[PDB]
Amino acid sequence: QLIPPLINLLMSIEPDVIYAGHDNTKPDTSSSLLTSLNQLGERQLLSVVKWSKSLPGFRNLHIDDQITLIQYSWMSLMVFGLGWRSYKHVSGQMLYFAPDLILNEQRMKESSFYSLCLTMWQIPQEFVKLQVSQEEFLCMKVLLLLNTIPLEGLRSQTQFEEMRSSYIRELIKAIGLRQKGVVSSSQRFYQLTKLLDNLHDLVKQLHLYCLNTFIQSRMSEVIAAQLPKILAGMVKPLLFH
């Protein structure tokens, strides 16, 4: 019938359209395309922060926990959002970074980062195969913000665990909206959470690309800074399987 209140609340705090400030009425160069993406990334970061403060439970956490979670989640959140837009607007056939920045297959190949494109393109394809709902996407997204904590843990550890548990229950409610039956629901939950778990690996790849693209545009200080985001055993991932 109706949509659960929390999920409806999630829909209403979804960030509105963010343009890249890209001119499509003129051919792109390797310089302008990368410049457009960085500008979009900066704008999307401020949006992630603004979105997190409207998230029930997030403000209860110590300011230091809030910072940490965003540091360990911005990449995942950005590529997951890209996955959703590409899925909804163009059936996952191309990368919908923004309304004024859509990369089709032929353009991805001509670029100097087709490999990265194929990696990111994995998500929209998965959304198509699973036929993910908006309600499911919204709950999964919050779970990404709460999927990695430091080895020592957080200051508001108990408050965090409770928040994580609430959104897990919400995802189950989202699934229940269409999956009627305990066997089908259980099977759906496994598929969606398996997808969430796989993002831990995929995101390390994106961080490496970012680190390698930096090196190419320009020493041990730079390496050491990003290492914790590409290497295993540095942080504590929260896996469902």
């Binding site: 401020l46 922060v49 300011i63 910072i67 540091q71």
Partner: peptide, 11 residues
């Protein structure tokens, strides 16, 4: 300088 930006944005 992301940590700084994230912190200022949160406040």
């Amino acid at each position: 300088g992301l940590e700084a930006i994230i912190r200022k944005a949160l406040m």
